[PDB]
Structure formats: C-alpha cells, structure tokens
Design a protein around this ligand. Structure first.
Ligand SMILES: *[C@@H]1O[C@H](CO)[C@@H](O[C@@H]2O[C@H](CO)[C@@H](O)[C@H](O)[C@H]2NC(C)=O)[C@H](O)[C@H]1NC(C)=O
Ligand SMILES: *[C@@H]1O[C@H](CO)[C@@H](O[C@@H]2O[C@H](CO)[C@@H](O)[C@H](O)[C@H]2NC(C)=O)[C@H](O)[C@H]1NC(C)=O
Ligand SMILES: *[C@@H]1O[C@H](CO)[C@@H](O[C@@H]2O[C@H](CO)[C@@H](O)[C@H](O)[C@H]2NC(C)=O)[C@H](O)[C@H]1NC(C)=O
Ligand SMILES: *[C@@H]1O[C@H](CO)[C@@H](O[C@@H]2O[C@H](CO)[C@@H](O)[C@H](O)[C@H]2NC(C)=O)[C@H](O)[C@H]1NC(C)=O
Ligand SMILES: *[C@@H]1O[C@H](CO)[C@@H](O)[C@H](O)[C@H]1NC(C)=O
Lengths: 71, 314, 228, 38
C-alpha cells in the first residue's frame, strides 16, 4: 500500500490501472478517490472520432432550447 | 500569452530558524504568521491550477484526426502531433520547448503542476482536430463534419467575400497558407526575443526566490548572523534581544515576498482570463472584433502549448 | 412555437429543481463571505500575541514593571499590532481589486447579453445565444442564459457548385445536399430541403475551374409562365 | 493520529473531503561526534 509519485510518497492508498474523473487532486496527473481509498491517473474525457471525408456533410434536423446559470 | 506561474510553498520554521531547537521555542510566542503564509500560498497554488484548467479544459470530448491527412491542398504537418517523437508533440511545440529554459532546499519548495505537459498537448491536439474536421460547430453542440474547402468558403462569406473567390483560387490560397506556415516556423526559430514574456515570468520568479534566500545572510544590526554562534557566546537575556531583532527582520522579508507573490499571481490570473477569452472566441469560432485575433480580417486561429503559457497562430 | 414553449418551460423548471438540489452551486458567492469573516477573525487573534514581549497584557506591563523597559515592551506591542493591521489592510485592498474586476465583467455581461443579443461564442452561455435574464443574489448576480443547441444530425453528400449549360451555380445563402438521388439546397443550421432554382443561386463563370462540381439541372420558375 | 492532527489544525471536530497540509517531518540525528586537532 506504498506508492511512489512525482510529488512524493503515498501511504495508505493503492494504485489502480483504471481511470476516472479527478476527485481529490494530488498532482502530476495523479488523483485520489474513495470507493477504501484508491489513487489513479485522471482521465481527460470521453474519446471520440469524427467521420471526415472529402464530400460528406452533417446537418441537424432538430433543436433544443437550453437554460444555463452563471453566478 | 502566459497562463500560470510556478506553484511554490515555504517551510516557516526551517527558514526563520536554523537547525537549532530552542529557536522554535522562542518563536512559539511570536504569533501564528505561519498559518497566514501557508493559507496564502495554497490559495495561490490552487489559483494556478484553476487558471490552467480554465484555459485549456474547454472540450468534453477528445477528437482524433483522421488517418489520411489530405485537406484539399492545405498542409497541417507543422502543427499536428508527430507520432515519430516519443513525446507526441508538434514541431512548433518542440521548438517552443527548446527555446525556453538551483536545488537548495532551505525550507523553500516547488510543488509540481497538476496537469502534465502530455495532457496539455492532448488537449491542444483535440482542439486542432475539432477545429479542422468540424469547423466551429463542435464548440456549440455535437460535432458535424464539413469538407475543409467548404469551411474556408463559409469563413470568406463571414468577412463579406463571396464563395466563388475561394472556389476559383483554391490552389493559390493553399500555397500562400503553406508558405506562411513555413515562414512562421523559420521566423520563430531565428528570433531570440520572440518568447520574452514566458522567459520574463521564469526570470522574475527565480530572481525573487534567490533574493529571498540571499537575504537570510544579513546581520540586521546584530553582532553576527549565525544564531548558533550567538547562543554559545552571550548571556541568554541579551542573546534573546539579538535573536528577536533577527527574527523580526527575517519575518519582514518573508512578508514582503508573500505580498509580491500575491500581486504577481493577480496579474497572471488576469492574463489567464484574457487567454481563456481568446481561446473561446478566436479558436472555437470567428470573431468580428477588430484586432482582437490578429491584424487584418480574421479567418481562424490555432493553439499551441508552451512552458507556462499558450501561443496562438492567427 | 408550441414545442419551443414547452421545451422552455421544462428547461426553466429543471433549472429551479437543480438550483434547489445542488448545495455547491452558489459556492462562488459563499466563498467571498467565507473569506472576509475568517480574515477578520485572524485579526482578532493577532490581538492575543505577545510579539516576543514578556506578557501580552498591556496594563500588566504598566503595573508590574517600571517605565524603563516597560516602554520597550509597549513599543514592541504597538509595532506588532500596527504591522498586523497594515497586513490586513493590504490584503483587503488586493481582494477589493479582484472584486472590482469581477464587477466590471458582470457589468459587461449585463450590458451585452441582457440588453441585446451577442454573437461572441461562449460569452453568454454554451451554444448559440438567444437571450438572458438577471436575478439578484447576496453580494452577486445570477444570469439565466437561454440558448439554442442543434441535435439529431443526419449525414448527406455535398458538392460546392452545380454545372449547368456550361455555367456554375453557387448557393446564394444555403448549401447543396443530396439524399442519394436528388439535389437540394438547404440552410446551414436546419434541414429544410428545397428545389434548386435560379433565384436562390447565383452564377459566376463556367464550370471548368472549380473542383468537385457535379452535373444537375436547375429549374427556372419563369419558363412555365412564358410557356402559357 | 494524522486525522487527529488535521482536526487540531482546522480547529474543528469534522473535516470535509479534500487534502490538507498539517505539518512537516525531519529525521532526527542519531548520535554525536567531535573532531579536534592532535
Ligand atoms: C424534435 O425533437 C422534439 C423533442 O426532442 C420532438 O418532440 C417530441 O415528439 C415526440 C413524438 O411526437 C413526443 O412524444 C415528445 O413528447 C416530444 N417532446 C417534447 C419535449 O414535447 C419532435 O417530434 C422532434 N421533431 C421531429 C421532426 O422529429
Ligand atoms: C507538407 O509539409 C511538409 C513540411 O512542411 C512536407 O514535408 C516535406 O516533404 C519533403 C518530401 O517528402 C521532404 O523533402 C521535406 O524534408 C519534408 N519537410 C520536412 C520539414 O521534413 C510535406 O511533403 C508536405 N505535404 C504533405 C502532403 O505532407
Ligand atoms: C430524395 O428526395 C426526393 C425528394 O423527396 C425523393 O423523391 C421523391 O420521394 C418521394 C418519397 O417516396 C416519392 O413519393 C416521390 O415520387 C419522389 N419523387 C419522384 C420525382 O419520384 C427521393 O426518393 C429521395 N431519395 C431517397 C434515396 O430517399
Ligand atoms: C457533365 O456534363 C458535361 C457535358 O455533357 C460532360 O462533359 C463531357 O464529358 C465527356 C466525357 O469526358 C466528353 O467526351 C465531352 O466532350 C464533354 N462535353 C463538354 C461540353 O464538356 C461532363 O463529363 C459531365 N460530368 C460528369 C461528372 O458527368
Ligand atoms: C476523396 O477523399 C480522399 C481522402 O479523404 C482524397 O484523397 C481524395 O482526393 C478525395 N477526392 C476528391 C475528388 O476530392
């Protein structure tokens, strides 16, 4: 249960090959979360790929009215 | 544009005192300045991380460029990531890193940034792929693919020039764009003062820290600057006065450093907000504001990472 | 109209529910208060520091000792307290500057997103901006941005222009698409196919210079009229 | 306990989720030596 990161040494948390969103930031791309306590590398986001070609286009057929808040 | 500065932290007792123990005992009656200093420094550090995340993390998807890099005569090899290099960085990014450049831990530390350079490069690559393959629609909803010449026709239609102007002079415009990209690469390579701002930030921070650590060796009117020498030499009643003067001087210096750090952090945060606005407006869309995204009528822009900053190609 | 109104009502209800549910949503305002008081608290705590003197009680210093070194002790106390108050004032000034910058940003947002429609991307909400509402809040303002977001996209095959009788036709305001058999022109942000004619397209030069042009006919509205 | 030190540092009996800086460690000397001329 001893881990070595760029920031220093971590005691009490186990490294996991999985990836999630950062909850408790530690540093150097390493975050921690509770589920016991685990540590992992934060995931930037959901990967996506676009079907780009020389003569294809995508056109919307529906819309949505959205409301957002800003404090 | 600079974005973030170096996250620093300071150990109170080891700087204010030495390896002696009774110096801390003398300090214990002087108040709780250490708490204020720690709170301010953690505030600055979390503000730096917030600045970086706000500037770069603006897309909830990580797009990948198509394997075939043909865009109707337009050449993007100079800005797209190069798999040959192990770090997966564009040649411009490598040039920027190479163009921008001790270890005395006397209580002074440097906290690592939360986001590694690889993650920032990944964000920039995703932004480039999105703005190439999907125009600007990826910034306001689901990404929709559009052929690049059609996107250029749209952008010309934006500034008040009909589409036939592009559609009749496609190859000439592509040649001009490629030549411009090459000229930018060469000019940035051959200019030493082009990257003045980021080097200035680094120099300011390093020089301030060096001044702080150098000021420790001042007498401040005492008989000697070595507290261990003072304790082993004089009657403790008057060595107490000597140490009081030394501690007051060093605390004043530390307060000055903290205030300078706060002011610099505020300025850097303002610059980061400006950079975030530029990324939101000039990159993810076309702006009609004059001179906001370059000299002349604006067409588009591309981002690139840099040590403690970002570089926009308008 | 009816569908848009229903979507707007559902959205505003969802906003009310989400505001009533998440407790952290109003952190930015709360932090302000959570800053000020604690900073002030620190100042009070600084009143109970000896500052290196023999005692932290001033009248005790007067009563228990003669003037010679009592003056030194009192001077030390005064210097410490004055320095603490100066530090508090400077920190307050910095916070005031930051708050003033935020207030200027809020004033710009109120002037642009509320009193008009702005074309700046992501300045007044995520997506294509439509309009906005202000609301008051303790030491702050809450903006409700109403915005428009496309959805349910569809693939299509496109061409830049149309070659017809050796002439090149370009769309006047839309874009050419084709479901596979027929060619239409439609607006950019909404699929509204229409028959291609000579009034919604304009002609410039021949069809030998553009790249990717395709062959198709272009109906003329005045031909049937002249036929009769 | 480290949790107890965190509680003492924040001056409260309950600490919310996050990461907190409590103190610093330094390894103490083991023995003492002396070297003087002949
Ligand atoms: C565009 O989308 C809206 C909602 O996303 C569709 O409205 C829905 O229509 C279905 C079937 O008619 C109803 O069961 C739902 O209750 C409607 N939603 C709402 C919020 O009223 C609309 O039909 C879509 N338009 C097209 C042409 O498919
Ligand atoms: C796009 O531009 C790059 C560089 O600007 C071109 O790469 C050059 O290719 C030629 C022939 O293959 C080489 O002799 C050069 O050394 C390459 N440049 C560099 C910097 O290595 C590339 O050919 C252009 N076209 C495409 C389709 O990528
Ligand atoms: C592409 O759109 C056109 C225009 O609607 C389609 O042509 C008509 O399609 C309807 C739908 O079945 C038929 O009732 C009409 O008879 C068609 N017009 C003619 C002149 O025959 C066409 O079918 C669509 N193509 C595809 C592949 O969906
Ligand atoms: C579009 O129509 C034109 C006119 O019919 C085609 O041009 C002819 O192409 C054939 C085959 O290459 C030549 O033998 C003729 O001499 C051309 N005539 C003219 C007037 O140019 C053209 O090929 C068609 N394009 C497509 C994609 O079908
Ligand atoms: C079709 O797309 C491929 C790859 O995207 C490209 O090489 C080719 O030139 C395109 N064809 C035309 C006519 O543009």
């Amino acid at each position: 249960n001893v881990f070595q990161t760029r920031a220093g040494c971590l005691i009490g948390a186990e490294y996991v090959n999985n990836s999630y969103e950062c909850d408790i930031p530690i540093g150097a791309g390493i975050c921690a979360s509770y589920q016991s306590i685990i540590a992992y590398t934060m995931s930037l986001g959901a990967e996506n790929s676009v079907a780009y070609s020389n003569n294809s286009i995508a056109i919307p057929t529906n819309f949505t009215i959205s409301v957002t808040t800003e404090i | 544009l600079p974005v973030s500065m170096t996250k620093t932290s300071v150990d109170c007792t080891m700087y204010i005192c030495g390896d002696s123990t009774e110096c801390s005992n003398l300090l214990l009656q002087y108040g709780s300045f250490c708490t204020q200093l720690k709170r301010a420094l953690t505030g600055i550090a979390v503000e730096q991380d917030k600045n970086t995340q706000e500037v770069f993390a603006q897309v909830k998807q990580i797009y990948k460029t198509p394997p075939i890099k043909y865009f109707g005569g337009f050449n993007f090899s100079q800005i797209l990531p190069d798999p040959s290099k192990p770090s997966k960085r564009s040649p411009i990014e490598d040039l920027l890193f190479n163009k921008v450049t001790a270890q005395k831990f006397k209580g002074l530390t440097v906290l690592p940034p939360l986001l590694t350079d690889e993650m920032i490069a990944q964000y920039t690559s995703a932004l480039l792929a999105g703005t190439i393959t999907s125009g600007w629609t990826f910034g306001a909803g689901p990404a929709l693919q559009i052929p690049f010449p059609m996107q250029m026709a749209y952008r010309f239609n934006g500034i008040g020039v009909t589409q036939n102007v592009l559609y009749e002079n496609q190859k000439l415009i592509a040649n001009q764009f490629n030549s411009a990209i090459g000229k930018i690469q060469d000019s940035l390579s051959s200019t030493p003062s082009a990257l003045g701002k980021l080097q200035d930030v680094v120099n300011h921070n390093a020089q301030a820290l060096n001044t702080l650590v150098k000021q420790l060796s001042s007498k401040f009117g005492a008989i000697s600057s070595v507290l261990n020498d003072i304790f082993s030499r004089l009657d403790p009643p008057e060595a107490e006065v000597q140490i009081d003067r030394l501690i007051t001087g060093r605390l004043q210096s530390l307060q000055t450093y903290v205030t300078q750090q706060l002011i610099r952090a505020a300025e850097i945060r303002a610059s980061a907000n400006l950079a975030a606005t530029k990324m939101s407006e000039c990159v993810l869309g076309q702006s009609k504001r004059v001179d906001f995204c370059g000299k002349g009528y604006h067409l588009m822009s591309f981002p690139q990472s840099a040590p403690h900053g970002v570089v926009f190609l308008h | 109209q009816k569908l848009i109104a229903n979507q707007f009502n559902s959205a505003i209800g969802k906003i009310q529910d989400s505001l009533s549910s998440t407790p952290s949503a109003l952190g930015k305002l709360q932090d302000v208060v959570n800053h000020n008081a604690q900073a002030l608290n620190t100042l009070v705590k600084q009143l109970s520091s000896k500052f290196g003197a023999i005692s932290s009680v001033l009248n005790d210093i007067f009563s228990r000792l003669d003037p010679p070194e009592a003056e030194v002790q009192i001077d030390r106390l005064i210097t410490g307290r004055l320095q603490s108050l100066q530090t508090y004032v400077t920190q307050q000034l910095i916070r005031a500057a930051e708050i003033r910058a935020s207030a200027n940003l809020a004033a710009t947002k109120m002037s642009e997103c509320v009193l008009g429609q702005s074309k700046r991307v992501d300045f007044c909400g995520k997506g294509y901006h439509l309009m906005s509402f202000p609301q008051s809040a303790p030491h702050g303002v809450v903006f409700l941005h109403v915005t428009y977001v496309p959805a349910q996209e569809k693939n299509f095959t496109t061409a830049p222009a149309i070659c017809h009788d050796g002439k090149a036709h370009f769309p006047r305001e839309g874009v050419f698409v084709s479901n596979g058999t027929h060619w239409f022109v439609t607006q950019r942000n909404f699929y509204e196919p229409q028959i291609i004619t000579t009034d919604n397209t304009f002609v410039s030069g021949n069809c030998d210079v553009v790249i990717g042009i395709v062959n198709n006919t272009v109906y003329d509205p005045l031909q049937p009229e002249l036929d009769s | 306990d480290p949790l107890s030190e965190t509680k003492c540092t924040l001056k409260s009996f309950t600490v919310e989720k996050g990461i907190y800086q409590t103190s610093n460690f330094r390894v103490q000397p083991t023995e003492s030596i002396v070297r003087f001329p002949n």
